[PDB]
């Protein structure tokens, strides 16, 4: 174990560079407030003493715009209906929840939204009746591809007036793709007599039309859903009130933090203006990167707590909420611990069926590639997303290869003999810093886009290699000590 004093020094350095970079980004935003306001409209509110919120982000300004109008009221109605069903008719709770989900989808997306969800569900079920996993995967891929077609997009836009309902329908269908694909694959793999009647059409309708995750919520494993819908054990509503109170308090705190950190610094406006990235100093570049990844983390905390809170009230166990990205230090850790539900779906339904490590390293590579391909194609399959997927697969493959190489008994014995485990920890932290220096760039490409990632690569690494790259590596080195030191808690 490392001595406590120098680990505390590493934590101090990590917090110091986070906070100084945040201050630099705040200064840059304040000194460039007028031109950014002129180019992109900035929302004016009295929540923070007159500071102007940066509404350039799409997911935040879309989900809060929907929540203030329809989503929060419908989610509260779902909570009330679930509690009433648990109190009065516990046996028929899944069907009541399914009916409420259909009614909520109708009232929020018109008849076409419900009709399209039903069509996708029915087609997936009819195809899965053949009990072939490959045919089911092609059916799911075709159903997902029907979203990206220009003609279908034009028809769907003609369906709706506000043009935000079309985006809501697209997101709902994209999530439904995963949900009915998971159910269909589970039906294909079902060979147990006890579970023969669990995979029926009404159960598929109940699984698909679950309101908390109808639109954006995390992928809920069908095994857990079917297990919890049939417990017939009450949740002691007196404790459910306390659970709701604590969840609401935490969600309000998270939302306030997200609003504060969007108000103080205009991350999205700065990334939208590529010419401003070249002008601002390297400290501002690092601060923008850290603030952007942290804001994505906080935004998805807010956007996943509400489905998680609704599940916890419903008795379900939700997938674990994202861990703080300032803890993350490697590609595998980021994938395992950030988006738990989608990672579990990819492992169970995309990674394993193609074939995991059982086919050897080369086969593993293919499997990983396939998984990554799908997730990129799931998010839209844009060019920047494909570049992010390629870079991310390269990172994961390099991590796995190095871990396999170092864990060989001969090399492990040699490194144990040469130096103490303290030196091994220091070298592992330096390596993980060199890895996270590219992990953050890949995530910036995912968030900022191709231009933002290229600008970061040029300025941080190519243009300023002699001292800027070394300083970034050292700061991420202390950061990696902190991350690895905390990683033992959840290892």
């Amino acid at each position: 174990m490392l001595p406590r004093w120098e680990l505390a020094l590493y934590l101090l350095a990590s917090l110091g560079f986070h906070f100084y970079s945040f201050y630099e980004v705040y200064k840059v935003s304040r000194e460039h407030e007028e031109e950014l306001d002129q180019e992109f409209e900035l929302e004016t509110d009295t929540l923070f003493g007159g500071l102007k919120k940066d509404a350039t982000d799409f997911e935040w300004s879309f989900w809060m715009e929907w929540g203030k109008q329809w989503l929060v009221w419908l989610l509260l109605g779902h909570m009330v209906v679930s509690q009433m069903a648990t109190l009065l008719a516990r046996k028929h709770r899944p069907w009541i929840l399914m009916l409420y989900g259909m009614w909520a989808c109708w009232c929020v997306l018109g008849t076409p939204g419900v009709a399209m969800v039903l069509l996708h569900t029915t087609i997936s079920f009819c195809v899965a009746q053949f009990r072939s996993q490959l045919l089911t995967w092609l059916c799911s891929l075709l159903l997902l591809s029907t979203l990206r077609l220009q003609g279908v997009e034009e028809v769907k836009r003609r369906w709706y007036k506000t043009e935000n309902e079309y985006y809501l329908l697209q997101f709902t269908l994209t999530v439904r793709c995963l949900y009915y694909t998971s159910f269909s694959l589970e039906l294909c793999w079902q060979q147990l007599p006890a579970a023969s009647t669990s995979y029926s059409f009404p159960w598929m309708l109940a699984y698909v039309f679950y309101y908390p995750v109808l639109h954006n919520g995390p992928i809920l494993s069908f095994s857990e859903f079917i297990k919890q819908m049939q417990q017939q054990e009450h949740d002691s509503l007196k404790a459910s009130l306390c659970v709701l109170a604590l969840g609401l308090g935490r969600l309000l705190c998270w939302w306030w933090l997200a609003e504060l950190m969007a108000h103080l610094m205009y991350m999205h406006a700065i990334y939208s203006s590529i010419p401003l990235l070249e002008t601002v100093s390297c400290w501002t570049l690092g601060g923008l990167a850290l603030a952007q990844v942290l804001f994505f983390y906080v935004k998805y905390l807010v956007l996943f707590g509400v489905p998680a809170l609704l599940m916890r009230l419903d008795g379900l166990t939700p997938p674990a909420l994202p861990r703080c990205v300032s803890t993350m230090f490697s590609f595998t850790g980021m994938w395992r611990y950030f988006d738990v539900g989608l990672h579990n779906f990819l492992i169970r339904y995309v990674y394993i069926p193609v074939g995991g490590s059982q086919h050897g390293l080369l086969g593993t590579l293919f499997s990983t590639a396939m998984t990554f391909a799908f997730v990129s194609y799931w998010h839209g399959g844009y060019d920047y997303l494909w570049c992010w997927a390629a870079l991310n697969w390269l990172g994961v493959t390099v991590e796995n290869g190095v871990r396999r190489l170092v864990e060989t008994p001969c090399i492990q014995d040699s490194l144990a003999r040469y130096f103490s485990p303290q030196a091994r920890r220091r070298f592992h932290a330096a390596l993980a810093s060199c890895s996270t220096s590219m992990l953050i760039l890949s995530n910036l490409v995912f968030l900022g886009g191709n231009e933002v990632g290229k600008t970061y690569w040029n300025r941080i690494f190519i243009q300023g290699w002699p001292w800027v790259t070394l300083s970034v590596l050292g700061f991420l080195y202390c950061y990696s000590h902190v991350g690895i030191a905390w990683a033992q808690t959840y290892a």
Partner: antibody, heavy 113, light 111 residues
Framework: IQLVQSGPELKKPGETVKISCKAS????????MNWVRQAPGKGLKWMGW????????TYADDFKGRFAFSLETAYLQINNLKDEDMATYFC????????????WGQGTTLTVS | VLMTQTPLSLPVSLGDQVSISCRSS???????????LEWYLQKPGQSPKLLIY???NRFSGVPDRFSGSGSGTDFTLKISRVEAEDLGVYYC?????????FGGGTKLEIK
């Protein structure tokens, strides 16, 4: 539809043995496979099962840490470390609905002494 | 789940009705709304054969005289007329609660 097993097997207490269950007359991956054992002085004990479609075995709590189910798709093998157990091992096809075991193997009597 | 059988050894002469009771430790009714309790006849020196799959149901091989009716916890199997070819060991098996457990075994003998 029939299931045929390897045959009698004699092994030393320290060694290990593999028992094969070959299924014919039906789509092998359609139905899972159940491995049970019958001790000379006891009744049937359900050791575990293997999902032929995905190859994911689930074992009973008692029969864990030493037994492993593998595929050869249409034989299906079991591996274990030898010990005082000398039970006769049965292989059973499991039907999709309403009942568990329909067709059984002959059973490979195992002698470990 | 521990499942016991009464009687352990049941001697009946040829052509006489026989009743075998299987008592479970707890409820066998699965969450699906049905109970998976089935009865296996293992003749000496071979593998068991299924007789009734769900309560009061009958397999294709079993003749009409193997009707067995049971409650939620205590189940029973009845042979109206023993044809002297039904001798063997009868095991009651539950599939609802993992791990799946067989019965002790009710050996039949000619008195």
């Amino acid at each position: 539809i029939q299931l045929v097993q390897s045959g009698p097997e004699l092994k030393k207490p320290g060694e290990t043995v593999k028992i094969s269950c070959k299924a014919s007359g039906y789509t092998f991956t359609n139905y899972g496979m159940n491995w049970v054992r019958q001790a000379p002085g006891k009744g049937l004990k359900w050791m575990g099962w293997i999902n032929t479609y995905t190859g994911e075995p689930t074992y009973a709590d008692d029969f864990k840490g030493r037994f492993a189910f593998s595929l050869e798709t249409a034989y299906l093998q079991i591996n274990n470390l030898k010990d005082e157990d000398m039970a006769t091992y049965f292989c059973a096809r499991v039907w999709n609905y309403d009942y568990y075991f329909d067709y059984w193997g002959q059973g490979t009597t195992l002698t470990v002494s | 789940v521990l499942m016991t059988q009464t009687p352990l050894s049941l001697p009946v002469s040829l052509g006489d009705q026989v009743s075998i009771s299987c008592r479970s430790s707890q409820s066998i009714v699965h969450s699906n709304g049905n109970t998976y309790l089935e009865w296996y006849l293992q003749k000496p020196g071979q593998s068991p054969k299924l007789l009734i799959y769900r309560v009061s149901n009958r397999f294709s091989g079993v003749p009409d005289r193997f009707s067995g009716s049971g409650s939620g916890t205590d189940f029973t199997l009845k042979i109206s007329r023993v044809e002297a070819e039904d001798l063997g060991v009868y095991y009651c098996f539950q599939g609802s609660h993992v791990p799946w457990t067989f019965g002790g075994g009710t050996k039949l003998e000619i008195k």
